Amino acid sequence: FPIVQVVGFQNSGKTTFIERILEKASEQGLNLGCLKHHDRYQAAGADVTAVEGAGVLQLTARRLWDLTRLIELYQFLETDCLLIEGFKKAPYPKVVILSEKEDLEALKTVNTIAIIYRKKEHMTEHQGLPIFHADDPVAVDLVLSQLK
Amino acid sequence: FPIVQVVGFQNSGKTTFIERILEKASEQGLNLGCLKHHDRYQAAGADVTAVEGAGVLQLTARRLWDLTRLIELYQFLETDCLLIEGFKKAPYPKVVILSEKEDLEALKTVNTIAIIYRKKEHMTEHQGLPIFHADDPVAVDLVLSQLK
């Protein structure tokens, strides 16, 4: 069940990058979920509430969620794979967006498979993985190949 | 996995009735879901998308939903039971809200366990089940006992 993450400080270009990836996954018919780390007065009493109609479910669920259970949920709704924005702490392969060379420090994490710096001229050469410009299409293609 | 439905034309008092039921289920610690028959530009490309943070999941999922699969979903998120607004066509026990005596005709369905007429003085006596006024607490208590 392939998984790639996107991690980066606020205003790095994360949701544009993700957007580009999801658009290109539609074409290709790839069946890919998206998860972002961050009925009305029904909720003002209950825990798991939802609306459904014409093939779309809108669901709100108050649980003690961790990433593992969220991934099981995605497996249950029968997606092929998963794009995650955030959960830096998770073990899954991830693409790191840097606004500044000194972003990579506070973004402490494993299984980094690429870096999108955001202001390219700043890039001290970094061992062990490929480096792209933010608008480089290979970088969105790199993510899709890992998602299969 | 106990199930009760609430069915009735628009503006019968359905969501107030449900509200009353859910409030009283909170007290009692009953663990009960709610389902109503009827990330943003992430959706503008993908099918299953979500946001999670501080223990609440907000999920949107484009599938060919039918009631059976929605109930499995509720079983997976580990609710004890389920309150449904709508799906008149489903087999589950249901409470019917009538605004007018002639509402019961177009509301064609099985497994009706009670009627809440809404303008009580109109009630032709109806065989085979109990009859309440809209604000009768026994009627919300009747639903809770069936939910256990």
Q: Do A61 and B56 touch (CB under 8 A)?
A: yes
Q: How far is A124 from chain B (nearest CA, A)?
A: 32
With H, G, I as helix, E, B as strand and everything else as coil, classify residue B122: helix
* Residue A2 near residue A94 (C-beta atoms within 8 A): no
CB–CB contact B63 A51 (8 Å): no
Q: What Å distances lie between residue B10 and A12, A42, A135, B1, CA to CA?
A: 46, 17, 50, 28
Facing A37 at nearest CB: one of B33, B44, B52: B52
The backbone torsions φ and ψ at residue A137, rounded to the nearest 5 degrees and listed phi first, read -65, -25
What is the domain extent for residue A11?
Answer: 1-148
Q: Give the single-character DSSP code of B21.
A: H
- Between the CA atoms of A21, A26, A27 and A31, what dihedral angle is there, to the nearest 10 degrees? 100
Output the domain CATH number for residue B56. 3.40.50.300
Which chain A residues have a beta carbon less than 8 Å from that of B36? Answer: 39, 42, 50-52
Name the domain count of chain B: 1
d(CA A4, CA A69): 16
Say which experimental method was used: X-ray
